[PDB]
Amino acid sequence: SMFMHNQALDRLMNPLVDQYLWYLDATSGNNLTFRKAGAKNFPEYFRNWIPGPGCRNQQWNKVGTKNNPQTGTWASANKWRLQGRLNKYAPGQPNAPAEGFLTNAGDLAFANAKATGATTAAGTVPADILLTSESETTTTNMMSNNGWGAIASNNQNASVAPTVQYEDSAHVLPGMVWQDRDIYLQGPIWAKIPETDGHFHPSPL
Amino acid sequence: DGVGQSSGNWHCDSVWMGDRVLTKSTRTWSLPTYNNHLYKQINGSGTGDAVYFGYSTPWGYFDFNRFHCHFSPRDWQRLVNNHWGIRPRRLNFKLFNIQVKEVTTTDGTKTIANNLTSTVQVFADTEHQLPYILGSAHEGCMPPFPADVFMLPQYGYLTLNGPGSNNNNLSTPSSAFYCLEYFPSQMLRTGNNFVFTYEFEKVPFHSMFMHNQALDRLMNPLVDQYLWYLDATSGNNLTFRKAGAKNFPEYFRNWIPGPGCRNQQWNKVGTKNNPQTGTWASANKWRLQGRLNKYAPGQPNAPAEGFLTNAGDLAFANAKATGATTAAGTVPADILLTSESETTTTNMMSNNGWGAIASNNQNASVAPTVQYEDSAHVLPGMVWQDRDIYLQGPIWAKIPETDGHFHPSPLMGGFGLKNPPPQILIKNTPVPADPPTQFSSQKINSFITQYSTGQMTVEIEWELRKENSKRWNPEIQYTANFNNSANAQFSVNNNGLYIEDRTIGTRYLTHTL
Amino acid sequence: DGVGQSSGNWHCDSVWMGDRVLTKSTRTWSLPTYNNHLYKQINGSGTGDAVYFGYSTPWGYFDFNRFHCHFSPRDWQRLVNNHWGIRPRRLNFKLFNIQVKEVTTTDGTKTIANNLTSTVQVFADTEHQLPYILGSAHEGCMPPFPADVFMLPQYGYLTLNGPGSNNNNLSTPSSAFYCLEYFPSQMLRTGNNFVFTYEFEKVPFHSMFMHNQALDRLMNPLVDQYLWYLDATSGNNLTFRKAGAKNFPEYFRNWIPGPGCRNQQWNKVGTKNNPQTGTWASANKWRLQGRLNKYAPGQPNAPAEGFLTNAGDLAFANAKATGATTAAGTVPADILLTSESETTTTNMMSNNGWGAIASNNQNASVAPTVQYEDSAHVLPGMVWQDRDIYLQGPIWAKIPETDGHFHPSPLMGGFGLKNPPPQILIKNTPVPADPPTQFSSQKINSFITQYSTGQMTVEIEWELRKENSKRWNPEIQYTANFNNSANAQFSVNNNGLYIEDRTIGTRYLTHTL
């Protein structure tokens, strides 16, 4: 798909007319109160579709003075382990980072022909290194600077108040849509799907 | 043809054949002039979870998407007791008997006349090149009851927004603007009419059956399994028990319950609930582009008996309920709740997490421990039931076009479609008022106030799965309430208002898991 | 046919094929009664540079001549990035859904009714026997945005005038008077419609490309020329240098830059400009019949960077600009400037003359001198680029019929045509009021006030030159402004007003000179 979306998921609707669906807004006063979805309050609308999977990833600011001075980035990386040995998880799901931030190996990067040797360094991203951006996917996909959402952490009663907890990682669910990572001019074309008893959505990462 | 001859007839009925089935409906509508013949930008203010950028349009549209448009409460009863499944096949849409009227206002006395030469213009969008707002469960559908007259909703959409200064409501470079006069459309005077046909692509039947067995309960109780497991480590040696002897939790199984997540549960008895001035901070939320949206409805997880969730399940209201809110000591008499409890066999309940897993390594000194998993996503060997379709609920939805999607059944329930039925858009053609005698290049501001009305009709062809079950004993079926009442069920009252008593689920007949 | 059936449908879209391309547009118009059903003489006063003699006519006309009528800003982008040239081929014009309305005024309350039996009458002039006022870049075209409604302009022309006493406004014997009812025309009630077709004669494509090389720079830098010239006379002897050694100004060339004339240049920063209460005495003027006319626009000469000329180049304005004037410290946000700077390769800049030539004979005693030429006309071996076509600019113009004309490309840009598209003229047929009972031979003064409205449509067939270029590196292309904004580009605002951000030139893709 060569196209960037024209609308966000949460934003698919008609703003001019309210929904016919009712929800429980308020428990106050020893009674239940059902609000109606509408009146230009978007977060309360019902939706058929939810954003794509992903996981939270460490974010390094492109301005070097604002970054923690790590002699190298390994212990901070996202890792998956196989046969008792740890491998960096790269690149991850096509999650975009915050504006002005990046991740190590989370997204593709290239270099000029002027860059030789195994390393380059500059106060900001070097002039040789060519970064890529997944930001065109933020409509459907999940950003990397926070988890996927929140869920209920406890049962309630009249005495105890409701609480929630945050989910930093979200895997595949029914009714979940996402955009695959983009193909660049300097990037690979294909890959061989390994032969296994099962594989899910075999688009190369 | 002509001013004095009708362009159509009234067709509303239901034809029950063996395999197909054909439902006809027709209604009377009224179309105003929205935005005084103008497109308009609309946007929010400030940074917040609700912010938007979009356009409002001087066009109406026909939304038949909801079920009870096409079915009467008797046909629905007749549908769900006898059958295991239904899916759409064809639809046929027609407009006719268009009549356009002008409104002259002298003092506070309106004079409405009949303008014979005015036109309306309508087109169906078959390539889905417009933003698609159907399937978002808005209002403005046909009424449930054939004798009501309804006003068509205004068309509008909202596009990408982007940050700047303190306002996230700025238009991003890629914000799209669609002019609907840039579509070929058919212009209709009172004499001529409009029709087109459409055919659904094959989708799986919606399952009308409730399961006959739980997952964990699929087995023969009379014979024990041949599989062995480690029951007990006591005594410096390993002891292998054999699965059987009527101890079910120890059996091996091929299949595991469906995905879900834990959700806050509010007791239907108001005195037992924590007094929250409003429920937001307690809701299940997913976030997109740095703003939080309630997660609704969630996966089809049922709550505990006597409990419910906010927006986790669908809810409706009568015609007696007006305004944006209703309140009562218990669930109000107007609100119509839905229940997913028929799915508890395969699916997961919302009052606890999915299970437990091992929290640590062990040795002779340290004891084994476990932890609980409040959220479970999809795994191999996982089965689930999709949310049920109701009489008052939506029918289909448009699968968004993306590089990937998983099990695209709409979370409000329905038939996910790649190529859904085309949106149908209609407008009153503008008639300007008397122009000045001297020439001016500015736009024409003043028009003639007018509106239009006429009948529409919709014909759906449904395909249904016949039911063959050899169970001996009788089954649960839908039955009209057994009680005497001041007003009959699904009927009009003294004041003339049609009232729907219950959301009627489709799942009664049992089927073996 | 009849009162109750529409005579046409709404067609607006764009069909992109490989070679042909076909654009459709349709709009809603409103036609008043001009001059109260009368022809009238119009004339100036006194002797001056602006004096006129002519006639005003009770007829309207349809002007589609401007580009952005036919193209949307997306189609225009799609046009100019992919292609080296375009020329028109066919056009198709249609009127339909005519409706005529009468205005009765009782006190200050207008009552507008619908008069079914009134007619409008329209004709196309295919022999060009009327004075041709299209291509003079007047107002009254279709709006850029399909949803606007516009009022048709009044038709009028002005003929020869001649001197007498102190008044140059007298009518010369050969002043022509044209009665437009002396043309056969088709009379239309509400039921019947109007159509005709037209086909352009072959004209050269408009070049959509910006050159890849300057004239003086066409050569191989690596090898010197074999041609010899006289560099130096010193030492009582002649010395012949050889052209080469990377000294470009000395090279021989086959071609020389295009014609032009020097033009006054006003800096876009207002503090740097001389405070003239108005710019006339400083303008470039040409005079005809003893009266001076500004020369606008001149030859396609570009000015210096950061400078402009009055009327030397085209300029437009938004819909927010009303009234006859706008002012700002810099160029106003409403005014849309155009730039010819893409032509500086072949053409001449306006900030200096064309070159220098020898001013005297020499001898041993007297030194050689030169003089500068501020104006250069056409010579053999002279190449130039014609002015570019914009989205808001005119399309064609009518080549006047004369014994000679040179390179008839219109100076405002466009396609010069011998046989341009025919003017289309329309009028409300007069309906007299109640005549007196006794007979009178005088004209009927009193009529019934009425106007008319209805849709029109225009279909142009464009032929375009495909682009094949083997250059390795990417090219400049038109791109929507990358910035976030309160209002999107080329889109409607909160109040409902359509706003055009940029005049979009056609020249992006490079081509070798």
PDB file of C-alpha atoms in Angstrom, chain B residues 140-351:
ATOM      1  CA  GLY B 140     -31.125   8.903  11.263  1.00  0.00           C
ATOM      2  CA  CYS B 141     -32.107   5.437  10.113  1.00  0.00           C
ATOM      3  CA  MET B 142     -35.551   4.364   9.041  1.00  0.00           C
ATOM      4  CA  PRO B 143     -37.939   4.239  11.986  1.00  0.00           C
ATOM      5  CA  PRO B 144     -38.782   0.787  13.328  1.00  0.00           C
ATOM      6  CA  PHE B 145     -42.477   1.258  12.646  1.00  0.00           C
ATOM      7  CA  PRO B 146     -43.594   1.682   9.032  1.00  0.00           C
ATOM      8  CA  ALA B 147     -46.040   4.505   9.655  1.00  0.00           C
ATOM      9  CA  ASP B 148     -43.554   7.022  11.065  1.00  0.00           C
ATOM     10  CA  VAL B 149     -42.071   9.852   9.007  1.00  0.00           C
ATOM     11  CA  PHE B 150     -38.418  10.747   9.509  1.00  0.00           C
ATOM     12  CA  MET B 151     -35.982  13.485   8.523  1.00  0.00           C
ATOM     13  CA  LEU B 152     -32.790  12.580   6.711  1.00  0.00           C
ATOM     14  CA  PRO B 153     -29.488  13.195   8.527  1.00  0.00           C
ATOM     15  CA  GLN B 154     -26.881  15.695   7.440  1.00  0.00           C
ATOM     16  CA  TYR B 155     -23.715  14.379   5.837  1.00  0.00           C
ATOM     17  CA  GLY B 156     -20.329  15.263   7.244  1.00  0.00           C
ATOM     18  CA  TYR B 157     -16.917  13.799   7.872  1.00  0.00           C
ATOM     19  CA  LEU B 158     -13.798  14.719   9.757  1.00  0.00           C
ATOM     20  CA  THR B 159     -10.222  14.362   8.554  1.00  0.00           C
ATOM     21  CA  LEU B 160      -6.708  14.391  10.016  1.00  0.00           C
ATOM     22  CA  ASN B 161      -5.818  17.091  12.506  1.00  0.00           C
ATOM     23  CA  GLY B 162      -2.384  18.074  13.716  1.00  0.00           C
ATOM     24  CA  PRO B 163      -0.648  20.013  16.452  1.00  0.00           C
ATOM     25  CA  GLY B 164       0.484  23.585  16.626  1.00  0.00           C
ATOM     26  CA  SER B 165       0.817  26.237  19.358  1.00  0.00           C
ATOM     27  CA  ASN B 166      -1.728  25.114  22.014  1.00  0.00           C
ATOM     28  CA  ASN B 167      -4.223  23.928  19.367  1.00  0.00           C
ATOM     29  CA  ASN B 168      -4.188  20.337  18.101  1.00  0.00           C
ATOM     30  CA  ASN B 169      -7.045  21.242  15.751  1.00  0.00           C
ATOM     31  CA  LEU B 170      -4.939  22.641  12.919  1.00  0.00           C
ATOM     32  CA  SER B 171      -5.285  21.035   9.509  1.00  0.00           C
ATOM     33  CA  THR B 172      -2.450  18.761   8.483  1.00  0.00           C
ATOM     34  CA  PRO B 173      -1.167  19.059   4.892  1.00  0.00           C
ATOM     35  CA  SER B 174      -2.854  15.787   3.988  1.00  0.00           C
ATOM     36  CA  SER B 175      -6.270  16.774   5.318  1.00  0.00           C
ATOM     37  CA  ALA B 176      -8.612  15.889   2.475  1.00  0.00           C
ATOM     38  CA  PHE B 177     -11.476  18.022   1.206  1.00  0.00           C
ATOM     39  CA  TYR B 178     -14.153  16.271  -0.850  1.00  0.00           C
ATOM     40  CA  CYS B 179     -16.621  18.230  -2.964  1.00  0.00           C
ATOM     41  CA  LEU B 180     -19.698  16.114  -3.588  1.00  0.00           C
ATOM     42  CA  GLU B 181     -20.743  18.062  -6.675  1.00  0.00           C
ATOM     43  CA  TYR B 182     -17.603  16.666  -8.310  1.00  0.00           C
ATOM     44  CA  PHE B 183     -19.469  13.275  -8.535  1.00  0.00           C
ATOM     45  CA  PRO B 184     -21.894  12.623 -11.409  1.00  0.00           C
ATOM     46  CA  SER B 185     -25.396  12.617  -9.953  1.00  0.00           C
ATOM     47  CA  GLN B 186     -28.921  12.208 -11.288  1.00  0.00           C
ATOM     48  CA  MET B 187     -31.205  15.240 -11.132  1.00  0.00           C
ATOM     49  CA  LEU B 188     -34.839  14.397 -10.384  1.00  0.00           C
ATOM     50  CA  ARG B 189     -37.955  16.489 -10.824  1.00  0.00           C
ATOM     51  CA  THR B 190     -41.268  15.263  -9.418  1.00  0.00           C
ATOM     52  CA  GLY B 191     -42.036  12.948 -12.334  1.00  0.00           C
ATOM     53  CA  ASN B 192     -38.911  10.803 -12.645  1.00  0.00           C
ATOM     54  CA  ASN B 193     -37.614   8.323 -10.045  1.00  0.00           C
ATOM     55  CA  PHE B 194     -34.381   6.572  -9.023  1.00  0.00           C
ATOM     56  CA  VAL B 195     -33.293   2.943  -8.585  1.00  0.00           C
ATOM     57  CA  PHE B 196     -30.192   0.761  -8.343  1.00  0.00           C
ATOM     58  CA  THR B 197     -29.292  -2.787  -7.323  1.00  0.00           C
ATOM     59  CA  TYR B 198     -26.474  -4.243  -5.227  1.00  0.00           C
ATOM     60  CA  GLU B 199     -25.132  -7.699  -4.390  1.00  0.00           C
ATOM     61  CA  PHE B 200     -23.227  -8.714  -1.259  1.00  0.00           C
ATOM     62  CA  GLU B 201     -20.069 -10.784  -1.415  1.00  0.00           C
ATOM     63  CA  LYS B 202     -20.204 -14.132   0.328  1.00  0.00           C
ATOM     64  CA  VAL B 203     -19.655 -13.920   4.089  1.00  0.00           C
ATOM     65  CA  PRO B 204     -20.034 -16.599   6.767  1.00  0.00           C
ATOM     66  CA  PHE B 205     -23.449 -17.078   8.310  1.00  0.00           C
ATOM     67  CA  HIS B 206     -24.027 -15.471  11.661  1.00  0.00           C
ATOM     68  CA  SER B 207     -24.433 -18.269  14.166  1.00  0.00           C
ATOM     69  CA  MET B 208     -27.916 -18.179  15.677  1.00  0.00           C
ATOM     70  CA  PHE B 209     -27.215 -20.985  18.126  1.00  0.00           C
ATOM     71  CA  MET B 210     -26.133 -21.187  21.744  1.00  0.00           C
ATOM     72  CA  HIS B 211     -23.718 -23.980  22.517  1.00  0.00           C
ATOM     73  CA  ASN B 212     -24.806 -27.280  24.003  1.00  0.00           C
ATOM     74  CA  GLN B 213     -21.545 -27.875  25.923  1.00  0.00           C
ATOM     75  CA  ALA B 214     -18.737 -26.003  27.641  1.00  0.00           C
ATOM     76  CA  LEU B 215     -15.193 -26.311  26.323  1.00  0.00           C
ATOM     77  CA  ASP B 216     -13.734 -27.799  29.493  1.00  0.00           C
ATOM     78  CA  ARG B 217     -16.715 -30.189  29.558  1.00  0.00           C
ATOM     79  CA  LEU B 218     -16.158 -31.824  26.145  1.00  0.00           C
ATOM     80  CA  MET B 219     -15.377 -35.470  26.914  1.00  0.00           C
ATOM     81  CA  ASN B 220     -16.810 -38.835  27.897  1.00  0.00           C
ATOM     82  CA  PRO B 221     -17.284 -38.935  31.691  1.00  0.00           C
ATOM     83  CA  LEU B 222     -17.568 -42.714  31.753  1.00  0.00           C
ATOM     84  CA  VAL B 223     -13.993 -43.563  30.678  1.00  0.00           C
ATOM     85  CA  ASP B 224     -10.721 -42.110  31.944  1.00  0.00           C
ATOM     86  CA  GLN B 225      -7.981 -40.761  29.693  1.00  0.00           C
ATOM     87  CA  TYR B 226      -4.789 -42.639  28.897  1.00  0.00           C
ATOM     88  CA  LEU B 227      -2.572 -39.616  29.572  1.00  0.00           C
ATOM     89  CA  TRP B 228      -0.344 -39.314  32.642  1.00  0.00           C
ATOM     90  CA  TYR B 229       0.879 -36.230  34.504  1.00  0.00           C
ATOM     91  CA  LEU B 230       2.996 -35.388  37.538  1.00  0.00           C
ATOM     92  CA  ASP B 231       0.704 -34.932  40.515  1.00  0.00           C
ATOM     93  CA  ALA B 232       2.996 -35.083  43.532  1.00  0.00           C
ATOM     94  CA  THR B 233       6.684 -34.573  44.288  1.00  0.00           C
ATOM     95  CA  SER B 234       6.497 -35.627  47.952  1.00  0.00           C
ATOM     96  CA  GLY B 235       8.957 -38.103  49.417  1.00  0.00           C
ATOM     97  CA  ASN B 236      12.043 -37.398  47.274  1.00  0.00           C
ATOM     98  CA  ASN B 237      10.398 -39.053  44.276  1.00  0.00           C
ATOM     99  CA  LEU B 238       8.106 -38.337  41.354  1.00  0.00           C
ATOM    100  CA  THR B 239       4.537 -39.655  41.281  1.00  0.00           C
ATOM    101  CA  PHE B 240       2.525 -39.795  38.050  1.00  0.00           C
ATOM    102  CA  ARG B 241      -1.247 -39.707  38.396  1.00  0.00           C
ATOM    103  CA  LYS B 242      -3.465 -40.869  35.547  1.00  0.00           C
ATOM    104  CA  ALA B 243      -6.066 -38.488  34.158  1.00  0.00           C
ATOM    105  CA  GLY B 244      -9.528 -39.726  35.016  1.00  0.00           C
ATOM    106  CA  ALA B 245     -11.624 -40.849  37.962  1.00  0.00           C
ATOM    107  CA  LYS B 246     -14.125 -38.039  37.356  1.00  0.00           C
ATOM    108  CA  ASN B 247     -11.565 -35.336  38.174  1.00  0.00           C
ATOM    109  CA  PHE B 248     -12.136 -32.926  35.327  1.00  0.00           C
ATOM    110  CA  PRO B 249      -9.636 -30.082  35.923  1.00  0.00           C
ATOM    111  CA  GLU B 250      -6.766 -32.509  35.369  1.00  0.00           C
ATOM    112  CA  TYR B 251      -7.889 -33.686  31.914  1.00  0.00           C
ATOM    113  CA  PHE B 252      -5.909 -32.812  28.816  1.00  0.00           C
ATOM    114  CA  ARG B 253      -7.761 -30.746  26.242  1.00  0.00           C
ATOM    115  CA  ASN B 254      -7.235 -29.674  22.648  1.00  0.00           C
ATOM    116  CA  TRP B 255      -8.855 -26.246  22.872  1.00  0.00           C
ATOM    117  CA  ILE B 256      -8.797 -23.221  25.180  1.00  0.00           C
ATOM    118  CA  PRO B 257     -11.188 -20.321  25.779  1.00  0.00           C
ATOM    119  CA  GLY B 258     -11.215 -17.152  23.736  1.00  0.00           C
ATOM    120  CA  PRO B 259      -9.353 -13.905  24.302  1.00  0.00           C
ATOM    121  CA  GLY B 260     -10.470 -11.034  26.445  1.00  0.00           C
ATOM    122  CA  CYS B 261      -9.561  -8.537  29.120  1.00  0.00           C
ATOM    123  CA  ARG B 262     -10.724  -7.774  32.631  1.00  0.00           C
ATOM    124  CA  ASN B 263     -13.335  -5.037  32.887  1.00  0.00           C
ATOM    125  CA  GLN B 264     -14.810  -3.081  35.784  1.00  0.00           C
ATOM    126  CA  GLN B 265     -18.184  -4.385  36.910  1.00  0.00           C
ATOM    127  CA  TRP B 266     -20.983  -2.230  38.293  1.00  0.00           C
ATOM    128  CA  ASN B 267     -23.773  -3.880  40.245  1.00  0.00           C
ATOM    129  CA  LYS B 268     -27.268  -3.378  38.847  1.00  0.00           C
ATOM    130  CA  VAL B 269     -28.456  -2.496  42.370  1.00  0.00           C
ATOM    131  CA  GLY B 270     -27.474   1.123  42.852  1.00  0.00           C
ATOM    132  CA  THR B 271     -26.985   0.943  46.604  1.00  0.00           C
ATOM    133  CA  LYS B 272     -24.142  -1.562  46.128  1.00  0.00           C
ATOM    134  CA  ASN B 273     -22.058   0.605  43.781  1.00  0.00           C
ATOM    135  CA  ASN B 274     -19.266   3.004  44.646  1.00  0.00           C
ATOM    136  CA  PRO B 275     -20.547   6.589  44.293  1.00  0.00           C
ATOM    137  CA  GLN B 276     -18.574   7.833  41.278  1.00  0.00           C
ATOM    138  CA  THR B 277     -19.665  11.215  39.937  1.00  0.00           C
ATOM    139  CA  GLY B 278     -18.893   9.810  36.497  1.00  0.00           C
ATOM    140  CA  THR B 279     -17.196   6.776  34.978  1.00  0.00           C
ATOM    141  CA  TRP B 280     -14.157   7.610  32.901  1.00  0.00           C
ATOM    142  CA  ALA B 281     -11.032   7.046  34.994  1.00  0.00           C
ATOM    143  CA  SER B 282     -12.371   3.532  35.667  1.00  0.00           C
ATOM    144  CA  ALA B 283     -13.094   2.670  32.026  1.00  0.00           C
ATOM    145  CA  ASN B 284     -11.081   0.395  29.769  1.00  0.00           C
ATOM    146  CA  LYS B 285      -9.240   2.694  27.381  1.00  0.00           C
ATOM    147  CA  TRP B 286      -7.074   2.375  24.305  1.00  0.00           C
ATOM    148  CA  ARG B 287      -5.007   5.318  23.120  1.00  0.00           C
ATOM    149  CA  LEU B 288      -4.224   6.494  19.600  1.00  0.00           C
ATOM    150  CA  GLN B 289      -2.070   9.465  18.538  1.00  0.00           C
ATOM    151  CA  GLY B 290      -1.549  10.499  22.134  1.00  0.00           C
ATOM    152  CA  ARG B 291      -5.210  10.695  23.106  1.00  0.00           C
ATOM    153  CA  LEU B 292      -7.261   8.185  25.069  1.00  0.00           C
ATOM    154  CA  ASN B 293     -10.439   6.553  23.775  1.00  0.00           C
ATOM    155  CA  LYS B 294     -12.761   4.327  25.761  1.00  0.00           C
ATOM    156  CA  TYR B 295     -12.569   0.722  24.620  1.00  0.00           C
ATOM    157  CA  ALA B 296     -16.110  -0.110  23.590  1.00  0.00           C
ATOM    158  CA  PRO B 297     -17.528  -2.500  23.203  1.00  0.00           C
ATOM    159  CA  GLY B 298     -14.779  -4.865  24.266  1.00  0.00           C
ATOM    160  CA  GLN B 299     -14.375  -8.459  23.297  1.00  0.00           C
ATOM    161  CA  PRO B 300     -17.631 -10.380  23.753  1.00  0.00           C
ATOM    162  CA  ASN B 301     -16.999 -11.177  27.412  1.00  0.00           C
ATOM    163  CA  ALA B 302     -19.858 -11.647  29.704  1.00  0.00           C
ATOM    164  CA  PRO B 303     -19.941 -10.083  33.169  1.00  0.00           C
ATOM    165  CA  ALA B 304     -20.966 -11.694  36.436  1.00  0.00           C
ATOM    166  CA  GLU B 305     -24.620 -12.450  37.059  1.00  0.00           C
ATOM    167  CA  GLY B 306     -26.301  -9.286  38.287  1.00  0.00           C
ATOM    168  CA  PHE B 307     -23.479  -7.004  37.111  1.00  0.00           C
ATOM    169  CA  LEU B 308     -22.719  -4.959  34.017  1.00  0.00           C
ATOM    170  CA  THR B 309     -20.001  -2.805  32.466  1.00  0.00           C
ATOM    171  CA  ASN B 310     -20.030   0.690  31.004  1.00  0.00           C
ATOM    172  CA  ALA B 311     -20.058   0.476  27.204  1.00  0.00           C
ATOM    173  CA  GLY B 312     -18.718  -3.076  27.390  1.00  0.00           C
ATOM    174  CA  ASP B 313     -22.056  -4.221  25.966  1.00  0.00           C
ATOM    175  CA  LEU B 314     -24.661  -2.604  23.761  1.00  0.00           C
ATOM    176  CA  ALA B 315     -27.633  -0.706  25.170  1.00  0.00           C
ATOM    177  CA  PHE B 316     -30.644   0.992  23.618  1.00  0.00           C
ATOM    178  CA  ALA B 317     -33.597   3.132  24.686  1.00  0.00           C
ATOM    179  CA  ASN B 318     -37.298   3.543  24.015  1.00  0.00           C
ATOM    180  CA  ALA B 319     -38.946   6.408  22.220  1.00  0.00           C
ATOM    181  CA  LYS B 320     -40.138   7.640  25.612  1.00  0.00           C
ATOM    182  CA  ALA B 321     -36.523   8.401  26.474  1.00  0.00           C
ATOM    183  CA  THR B 322     -35.557  11.844  25.208  1.00  0.00           C
ATOM    184  CA  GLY B 323     -32.625  14.012  26.117  1.00  0.00           C
ATOM    185  CA  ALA B 324     -29.093  12.813  26.592  1.00  0.00           C
ATOM    186  CA  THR B 325     -29.514  11.078  29.946  1.00  0.00           C
ATOM    187  CA  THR B 326     -31.826   8.936  32.080  1.00  0.00           C
ATOM    188  CA  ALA B 327     -31.524   7.807  35.689  1.00  0.00           C
ATOM    189  CA  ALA B 328     -33.221   5.378  38.059  1.00  0.00           C
ATOM    190  CA  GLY B 329     -32.420   3.476  41.230  1.00  0.00           C
ATOM    191  CA  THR B 330     -31.954   0.400  39.046  1.00  0.00           C
ATOM    192  CA  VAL B 331     -31.465   0.179  35.289  1.00  0.00           C
ATOM    193  CA  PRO B 332     -34.105   2.552  33.859  1.00  0.00           C
ATOM    194  CA  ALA B 333     -37.275   1.169  32.324  1.00  0.00           C
ATOM    195  CA  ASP B 334     -36.380   2.898  29.059  1.00  0.00           C
ATOM    196  CA  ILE B 335     -32.868   1.489  28.660  1.00  0.00           C
ATOM    197  CA  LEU B 336     -32.644  -1.870  26.901  1.00  0.00           C
ATOM    198  CA  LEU B 337     -29.650  -3.932  27.994  1.00  0.00           C
ATOM    199  CA  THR B 338     -28.076  -6.764  26.036  1.00  0.00           C
ATOM    200  CA  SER B 339     -26.486  -9.913  27.449  1.00  0.00           C
ATOM    201  CA  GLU B 340     -23.572 -11.951  26.101  1.00  0.00           C
ATOM    202  CA  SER B 341     -24.109 -14.665  28.730  1.00  0.00           C
ATOM    203  CA  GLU B 342     -24.895 -17.218  26.016  1.00  0.00           C
ATOM    204  CA  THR B 343     -21.191 -17.130  25.141  1.00  0.00           C
ATOM    205  CA  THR B 344     -19.782 -18.099  28.540  1.00  0.00           C
ATOM    206  CA  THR B 345     -19.251 -21.640  27.254  1.00  0.00           C
ATOM    207  CA  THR B 346     -16.482 -20.701  24.793  1.00  0.00           C
ATOM    208  CA  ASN B 347     -15.617 -17.124  25.811  1.00  0.00           C
ATOM    209  CA  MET B 348     -14.131 -15.545  28.942  1.00  0.00           C
ATOM    210  CA  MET B 349     -16.020 -13.759  31.700  1.00  0.00           C
ATOM    211  CA  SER B 350     -15.018 -10.212  32.643  1.00  0.00           C
ATOM    212  CA  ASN B 351     -14.926 -10.577  36.430  1.00  0.00           C
TER     213      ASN B 351
END
